[PDB]
Amino acid sequence: MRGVDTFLAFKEQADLKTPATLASLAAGDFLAFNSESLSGRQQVIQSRAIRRMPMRQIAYTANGTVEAGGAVEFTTSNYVLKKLLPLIFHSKTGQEDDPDGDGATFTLVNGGVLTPFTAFVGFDGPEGKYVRRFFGAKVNQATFSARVNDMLNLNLDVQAIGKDILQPGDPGWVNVTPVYPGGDEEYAYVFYQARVLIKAGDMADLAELPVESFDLTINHNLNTNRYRLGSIYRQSLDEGVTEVTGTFTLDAAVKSISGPALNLTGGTAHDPAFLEKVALYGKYAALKLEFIDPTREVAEGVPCRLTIHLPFVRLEEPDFQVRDPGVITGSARFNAYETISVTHVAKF
Amino acid sequence: MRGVDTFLAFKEQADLKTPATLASLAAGDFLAFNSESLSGRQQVIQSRAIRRMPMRQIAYTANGTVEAGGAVEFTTSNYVLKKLLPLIFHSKTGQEDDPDGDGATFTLVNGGVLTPFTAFVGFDGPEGKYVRRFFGAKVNQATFSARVNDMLNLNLDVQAIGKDILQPGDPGWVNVTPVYPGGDEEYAYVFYQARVLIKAGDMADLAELPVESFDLTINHNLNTNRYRLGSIYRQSLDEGVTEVTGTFTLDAAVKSISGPALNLTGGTAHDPAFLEKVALYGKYAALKLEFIDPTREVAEGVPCRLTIHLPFVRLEEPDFQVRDPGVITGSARFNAYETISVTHVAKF
Amino acid sequence: MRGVDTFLAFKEQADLKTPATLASLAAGDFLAFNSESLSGRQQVIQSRAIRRMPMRQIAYTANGTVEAGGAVEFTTSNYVLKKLLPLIFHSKTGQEDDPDGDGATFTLVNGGVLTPFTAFVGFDGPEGKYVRRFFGAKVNQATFSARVNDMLNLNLDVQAIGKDILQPGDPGWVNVTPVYPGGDEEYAYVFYQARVLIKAGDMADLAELPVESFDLTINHNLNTNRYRLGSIYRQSLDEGVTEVTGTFTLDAAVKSISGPALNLTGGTAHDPAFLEKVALYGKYAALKLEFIDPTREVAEGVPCRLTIHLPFVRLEEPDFQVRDPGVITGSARFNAYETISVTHVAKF
Amino acid sequence: MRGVDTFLAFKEQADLKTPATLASLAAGDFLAFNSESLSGRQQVIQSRAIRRMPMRQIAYTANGTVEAGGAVEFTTSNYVLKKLLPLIFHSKTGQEDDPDGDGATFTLVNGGVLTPFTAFVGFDGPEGKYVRRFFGAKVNQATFSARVNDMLNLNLDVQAIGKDILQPGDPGWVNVTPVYPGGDEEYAYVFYQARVLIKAGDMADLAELPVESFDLTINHNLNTNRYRLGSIYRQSLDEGVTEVTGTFTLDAAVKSISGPALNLTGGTAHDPAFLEKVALYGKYAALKLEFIDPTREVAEGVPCRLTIHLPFVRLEEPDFQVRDPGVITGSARFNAYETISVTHVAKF
Amino acid sequence: MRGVDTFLAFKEQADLKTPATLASLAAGDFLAFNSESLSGRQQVIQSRAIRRMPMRQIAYTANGTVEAGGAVEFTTSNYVLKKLLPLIFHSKTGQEDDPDGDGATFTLVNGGVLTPFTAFVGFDGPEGKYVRRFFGAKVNQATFSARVNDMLNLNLDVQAIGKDILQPGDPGWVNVTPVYPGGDEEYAYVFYQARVLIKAGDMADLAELPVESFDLTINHNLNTNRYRLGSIYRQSLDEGVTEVTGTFTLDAAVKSISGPALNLTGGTAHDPAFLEKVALYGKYAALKLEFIDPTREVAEGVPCRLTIHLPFVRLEEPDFQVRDPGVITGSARFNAYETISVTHVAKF
């Protein structure tokens, strides 16, 4: 088997306990991924009755609860986002390809819940055909990452209720053929389309920072330990409180490329201690990570766009250490507080 | 001192507390090793009486219990196995060079015990001569490892009661000269002599797997904390329950090279999910790791052989992750349950 | 032995592990080559057991995995192409000597595989007779090269599973007599039959470039490291992704000899920065390397022909350096992307 | 196009990111060069999403960061030096044609910076007209070389932010006509005007060495890897620490032609191991490479002059190997330490 | 200085750290060499304290460890061998000019060590007199080379502890006058005195091969990195394991000139694949490189002789490539394994 012999398909399921059928998979369900590590683990119970034996005994071993889940990396593309953003957030408003050009907005709501889905990891190679079905899956974490000379990546940590293996002849088997968007239909976001914008203190508008890389993690803090008597499976994947953290790498005392000057008082003079003072005084800043593809138009004059609005953000000490006689660089970590919004303007 | 200036010699001792003498060492006791890390550690006790002092004080420090032990790697050869297999297992039946050709079988028995031995790490170089004697030693762990373009290695984790240093002029000193088997007498096992065989479900016989590497660990779980008032030494090295684990690396959907087809129902059709289903359904499989040297005959038509019979084995999820568009490879871990047997057919 | 005393014969084998027999060689298997460098290498394993010895020891050395392969240069002729193009590409459609005159087309297909073959390098000279048989061979790389005052050359880099030596008296020996096409039957392509055609931007048709030389490499990126326990041989030669690169030498600001004008907007005015702008704007160009022999007719009015269609090609900076007061010449490297096709129209 | 059809023009630009316009070029900007190799390279990004495809595909490729730069060789002449010495060093004091006759002195200062410039490589030939503009250029390295029967050459390694192509009809195009100094106005330095002077230990003055050739490299160690999200271009060319190295070829045990005797104690007796002892004892020597043209007067009795003052220099082992029964010759490498000064006395 | 103005003298020193005095040099110490490249290198340490400075600073630079060594080429002659063979090998038995005629035998012993020596490279020319003394020198590598129309050459790679320069007036200076053997006393080995003999398989005796050239390298693998705190010098030159490799050039399928036929079964029929099969089957062969000067008698009927016995040798694939229609020639590389012996029968 080769990685090209395998397909990945997420499909949303009505109830957490009812896996999607392998015959319902259609266009839009199959995603091109960078790597998958979904797996299931069964727990083994050993009787505590003391017995003389040189080694473990089959008659006195039982198997207990099962876990399922793992990571999936994606290159954040057009259809990948269309499929995954609804699985990462609670509410969606609008349509990406809305003609007016405001796209779809994804937010976390007060008592919102995550959509459960079934992950199919199918294999069709010279050795044969079989599908790993992970049912009752939820996105536990989602990291957006942007590096130089790279694309925008999206790493999902998924928790599931259980795994099973479907093979030709099983009661729920269909010989599925993955269908993907055309090469001319699917688009990705590259590093040179990115813009990190910050605002703090009395700054009038968002000023663009020259960062080298950025990461943004949404962590839903699912409770993956709700077991009961009479079942080896998790009984739910209840979501806790969403923790939105992140990091971005940039120099010490950087000036803004565009927008106002980095100055907590809104003045025109640059503050070489801007981020350090933001971190030291516990100020709240507004971030905006924005990808714009001008070469792709969604409306009359509206380009493809992926904006992440993080109003109210608290930075840790920016980590600007004097390590050598060269340029002082560091990574500023941050935690988002009140809300996170994601607007995706895209045409399909 | 150089590593070539040193010798290693294990010798079996009647009682755990009576070290073997340095004059009893003879042919068969000295082993060629890859590396040794046997050492002793003394514990330092510091009085808790509160006293004003800028630093620790010699008058208020005592030294407590001592540990000894460490690792020794070997290239699993003819005489190395002859010497070490009796130290790793509880019972031996037969003789390796038995003319009929079934060799010696080493197994763990119900209430069996490990043989204690003394490890001599001797040095004889331009600087002088001295022996590190580790008395009351037992094999705590033993790992067999096979890699491609390598030999079969055996790593022993040894626990001992204590260490001492013998030097010219001590009451128990003898100027020992290590004697080793002739180059034409000693043989090793190479990777291309190895065969991993598996069996599960209704499979009729053992089918050979094409694995890239394998490891098998026997862990005797010695209790190394039995101290008493009136002695700085361990009072015993009581063995717990032997845990036999292992791992082997191979591809997803491997087909067997020889034997039947990998099929849990004994059919002739290949099952591309064989190991995954073995792990997911908690089935017990039979493994057999076997080295055969046809170029070395022990009987009329019986070749040198080292077989490790692991009936009843439980695999973890085989770890077949889609990491890249190339061949999907992974490592299947396993735990052995009821018994482990080791047959060594060898001529000396 | 002289190079004239040796023959070379490729023969296609059903399975990668079953070498072709030396008795199956017939007309069409024997090829006239410029030079061969096929060879096998055995790996030597040295025991890591530390031992005092001034030099390596025979008793403590083992031999490990084997590689085989090397290069073979051909003068791209009639029968050479007939034999080798099926070994370099995945799919073939048509017959070279098809009466209609479209020849055979060789392409890479989505999940296509390379044909394994056995290479016989036989020697029959005053010293005696013996054959080097390289079994399980695949074409790893194939370079087409055209220079002025030369013929079209084809250099193959071949990887194989192993080598063996056949001699009179061996179980698989036949006294083979090489049979070759008649001098009046075999034809080659000369430099003055070549045409390099390019197209980019809005150019309406392919415009001919005056190049001095060209090279085109197909690289199948075989995985030559798939070894296992129990075998010194490679277990497969799995092909990765085919990388098609190349280079052609020409002057700076060249005009086209025929076809439209080199103009990214399809106009009639020449663009002296055509290739530089193609490389700087990351445009995709279409190349066509075409050999035509009008003196050899395959159909009523169809000449012998070897066309290499490379639609979608990306040039690197054309390398037009001002080195001296003479004509500015340079080499434009390129990488092909979507597909490569090779049409061979030939009569045998 | 011929090398005579091309011109080269450097022009200093106010900010690193604002290229000089092609209409601002005037007398003094155009330089006669020996060879140019300025070029730009775009990086190509390949999506990591695993997909079945025989070859790279266009829809899944993006292009990333760009580099620009290359080498330019000059014959160190009057106006070439006037133009380039200000680009190689940090500070200039004086005017070459100062009547008093001390010329201009170029030095590296503590926190000094390099001047950014735009390099125009223009072509105007039978094929047409177009300019390669390399904007944001800095001198990364500068080598002065003197050989026998040659002129003094100056090789610049230049790093730039990016390249673009200007052509008739572009928004910033002007039909520039290169203007050069008259043949009777421009002068060069020949080998027979050179003098290498050394001083070490207690030597009272500088003693002239008879060297066969010399090289002196200034290396500014620019940081050419400062990229950010949202731009394919380098964000700066920050200069590190200037490393000034060099080499000169001469015979073993050479005596000085003029000045004192080569003697680390200032005595009149020659030391045949002078350079070897300077290198072995880690002594610091003072070098002075000086070109004087007596036939060209800049003041009443002051000739044209190019002096390179390298106080404090450390030689490596002079490389005086006995290779043959002839004269022992070798090359002494050196590293300059504290400061480097360059005085140019010239009339224009 | 000319190469004829210099002398070279090795002298054996009692301890590695005590250089031989320049007054102890006498007849037999001075050797005629082809070329020397002995040199010393001092390491320069740069403080890591970050400081603003355009260039390195003398106050913040220190110099560290020193290396010494280099190559010396000799024409393997009578006295050259007498002097150097004891420095290349561990043990010597016998005297070259022993009347019985078995000469001196040089071998590597189990725990043998190399003799340290001091190398004097003295210069006495019109410029003056001075000696380079390299103390604590050991032979790291020694290559014997034989070509057609050449003499037998011996290239030594020497590692030393340090270098110093002695000059008239130093505390250890003596005006040494080199004394050499008379022209009528010294003899060399020419190519036409050479014989390469091979034996493998069941061959009864050594059969002579017609080779074009040969090389044999002894490599002692000295550890040249044993430095300590408080010293800039190496603390030892500990020798590792001696690797004896070599190569000889010959034609493909060569027959033996004398001795038995090249046949792995001892038969009288020639095997055209002899060396290829020796390399492919991993057989061990016995080589013997032997120079005999019949015109020089050491005993009543015993001629001058230099034999290199290499029992047990493993050849790589002989490198017999079909490059052209002429005779197939190649080079067979080999590694010696168990022992190497060198017998020198010589009269002085």
List chains touching E (3+ CB pairs under 8 A): A, C, D
- Give, in order, the Cα–Cα distances in Å from B214 to each of B61, B288, C88: 48, 11, 37
- For residues A97 and C271, what is the distance between their CA atoms, to the nearest angstrom? 40
Residue E4: CB atoms within 10 Å: 11
Across the interface, of C33, C41, C127, the residue whose CB is closest to E255 is: C127
- C71: closest chain E residue by CA: E321
Q: How was this structure determined?
A: cryo-EM
- For residues D58 and D66, what is the distance between their CA atoms, to the nearest angstrom? 19
- C43 at interface of B, judged by CB pairs closer than 8 A: yes
Closest listed residue to residue A138, CA positions, set A122, A115, A167: A115
CA D283 to chain centre: 27
E264: tokens are 């792995």
- B154: closest chain C residue by CA: C49
| φ, ψ for residue B132, nearest 5 deg | -90, 120
Which position has the token pair 């230990």? D201
| φ, ψ for residue C4, nearest 5 deg | -80, -20
CB E52 within 8 Å of CB D110: yes
C94, burial (CB in 10 Å: exposed 0-12, middle 13-18, buried 19+): middle
DSSP E254: P
Closest listed residue to residue C40, CA positions, set C135, C180, C171, C153: C135
Please give the helix or strand (H or E) that residue A78 lies within, else none. helix A78-88
Give C4's contacts in chain E (Cβ within 8 Å): 325
B214: tokens are 């394998």
Interface test with B, best of D46, D50, D56 (most B CBs within 10 A): D50
Closest listed residue to residue C332, CA positions, set C158, C211, C155: C211
DSSP C180: -
Sign (positive/negative) of CA torsion C137, C140, C146, C150?
A: negative
- Are C280 and D163 an interchain contact pair (Cβ–Cβ within 8 Å)? yes
Which position has the token pair 């499989």? B285
Cα three-residue angle B196-B201-B205, rounded to 5 degrees? 50
- Are C327 and D1 an interchain contact pair (Cβ–Cβ within 8 Å)? yes
In angstroms, the first-to-last Cα distance of chain E is 32
Sign (positive/negative) of CA torsion C246, C249, C254, C255?
A: negative
- For residues E294 and E304, what is the distance between their CA atoms, to the nearest angstrom? 7
CB D282 within 8 Å of CB D329: no
Helix, strand or coil, per DSSP, at residue A99: coil
CB A37 within 8 Å of CB A72: yes
* Helix boundaries (H) for chain C: 78-88, 274-280
CB B35 within 8 Å of CB B72: yes
CB C285 within 8 Å of CB C198: yes
- Cα dihedral A347, A257, C281, D118, rounded to 10, equals 170
Question: Per-residue b/e over D25-64, b at no fewer than 16 CB within 10 Å?
Answer: beebbbbebbebbbbbebeebebbbbbbbbbbbebbbbbb
Chains D & E: contacts with CB separation below 8 Å? 106
- Looking only at the bridges linking them, the beta strands covering C35-36 and C6-12 are unpaired
CB C26 within 8 Å of CB C137: no
- For residues B130 and B118, what is the distance between their CA atoms, to the nearest angstrom? 16
CB B156 within 8 Å of CB B139: yes
E41, burial (CB in 10 Å: exposed 0-12, middle 13-18, buried 19+): middle
Helix, strand or coil, per DSSP, at residue D275: helix
Across the interface, of A33, A37, A127, the residue whose CB is closest to B255 is: A127
Identify residues after which chain C is interrupted (C–N over 2.5 A).
Answer: none
- C40 at interface of E, judged by CB pairs closer than 8 A: yes
Cα three-residue angle C211-C215-C220, rounded to 5 degrees? 150
- For residues C25 and C178, what is the distance between their CA atoms, to the nearest angstrom? 8
C26: tokens are 């017939």
- Are D55 and C108 an interchain contact pair (Cβ–Cβ within 8 Å)? yes
E231, burial (CB in 10 Å: exposed 0-12, middle 13-18, buried 19+): exposed
* DSSP per-residue letters across E263-291: -TT--SS--TTHHHHHHHTT--EEEEEEE
- For residues B44 and B67, what is the distance between their CA atoms, to the nearest angstrom? 12
Give D134's contacts in chain C (Cβ within 8 Å): none
Closest listed residue to residue B194, CA positions, set B155, B152, B156: B152
- Give, in order, the Cα–Cα distances in Å from B227 to each of A243, B61, B234: 49, 20, 5
CB D263 within 8 Å of CB A184: no
- D66: closest chain A residue by CA: A149
- Are D165 and C273 an interchain contact pair (Cβ–Cβ within 8 Å)? yes
Strands (E), chain C: 6-12, 30-31, 35-36, 39-46, 61-75, 91-93, 104-107, 117-125, 128-146, 153-160, 162-166, 194-199, 207-209, 211-219, 243-251, 285-297, 303-315, 329-336, 341-345
* DSSP per-residue letters across E146-203: E-TTSB-EEEEEEEESEEEEE-TTSTT----------TTT--B-BGGGEEEEEE-TT-
CB-side neighbour CA atoms (13 Å) of D55: 22
- For residues D275 and D201, what is the distance between their CA atoms, to the nearest angstrom? 11
Give D58's contacts in chain A (Cβ within 8 Å): 183
Closest listed residue to residue A329, CA positions, set E50, D112, D228, D68: D228
Give D49's contacts in chain A (Cβ within 8 Å): 32-34, 74-75, 77
DSSP B191: G
Which residue type is seen at D311? P
Give A6's contacts in chain D (Cβ within 8 Å): 50
- Looking only at the bridges linking them, the beta strands covering E61-75 and E35-36 are antiparallel
Helix, strand or coil, per DSSP, at residue A41: strand
CB E7 within 8 Å of CB E30: yes
- Give, in order, the Cα–Cα distances in Å from D112 to each of A78, C26, D336: 48, 77, 18
D221: tokens are 């160690």
Phi-psi sector, E29: left (phi>0), alpha (psi -120 to 50), beta: alpha
Sequence-separated (6 or more) residues with CB below 8 Å from residue E335: C56, E243, E244, E245, E246, E313, E314
Across the interface, of A3, A8, A44, the residue whose CB is closest to B328 is: A3
Which position has the token pair 């953003």? A85
Identify residues after which chain B is interrupted (C–N over 2.5 A).
Answer: none
| φ, ψ for residue B344, nearest 5 deg | -120, 115
- For residues D190 and D152, what is the distance between their CA atoms, to the nearest angstrom? 6
Sequence-separated (6 or more) residues with CB below 8 Å from residue E135: E13, E17, E18, E19, E20, E118, E160, E161, E162, E163, E164
- A127 at interface of E, judged by CB pairs closer than 8 A: no
- Cα dihedral E275, E281, E286, E291, rounded to 10, equals 20
Considering only residues 234 to 253 of chain C, which have any Cβ-Cβ distance to chain B shorter than 8 Å?
Answer: 235, 238, 240-241
- For residues D264 and D271, what is the distance between their CA atoms, to the nearest angstrom? 8
- For residues A63 and C340, what is the distance between their CA atoms, to the nearest angstrom? 55
The Cα of E127 is separated from the nearest Cα of chain D by a number of Å equal to 6
Sequence-separated (6 or more) residues with CB below 8 Å from residue E264: E200, E201, E202, E203, E271, E274, E277, E278, E283
C163: tokens are 């080598």
- E87 at interface of C, judged by CB pairs closer than 8 A: no
* Helix boundaries (H) for A207-327: 274-280
Give A130's contacts in chain B (Cβ within 8 Å): 272-273
The CA radius of gyration of chain E, in Å to the nearest whole number, is 24
- Give, in order, the Cα–Cα distances in Å from A179 to each of A10, A30, A176: 13, 7, 9
The Cα of D50 is separated from the nearest Cα of chain B by a number of Å equal to 5
Closest listed residue to residue C329, CA positions, set C247, C258, C206, C243: C247
| φ, ψ for residue B259, nearest 5 deg | 80, -165
CB D27 within 8 Å of CB D179: yes
Across the interface, of D58, D123, D167, the residue whose CB is closest to C312 is: D58
Q: Which residues are bridge partners to E124 per DSSP?
A: E129
Sequence-separated (6 or more) residues with CB below 8 Å from residue C14: none
CB A30 within 8 Å of CB A9: yes
CB D10 within 8 Å of CB D28: no
Sequence-separated (6 or more) residues with CB below 8 Å from residue E205: E199, E259, E260
* Quoted resolution (Å): 2.7
- A191: closest chain D residue by CA: D229
- A327 at interface of E, judged by CB pairs closer than 8 A: no
B158: tokens are 């040894």
Across the interface, of E53, E58, E129, the residue whose CB is closest to D284 is: E58
- For residues B145 and B25, what is the distance between their CA atoms, to the nearest angstrom? 29
- For residues B56 and A193, what is the distance between their CA atoms, to the nearest angstrom? 62
- A326: closest chain E residue by CA: E50
CB D77 within 8 Å of CB D96: no
- For residues E39 and E144, what is the distance between their CA atoms, to the nearest angstrom? 22
Sequence-separated (6 or more) residues with CB below 8 Å from residue C35: C71, C72, C73, E321, E322, E323, E324
- For residues B303 and B308, what is the distance between their CA atoms, to the nearest angstrom? 16
Which position has the token pair 């390590």? A323
- For residues C198 and C332, what is the distance between their CA atoms, to the nearest angstrom? 12
CA D100 to chain centre: 27
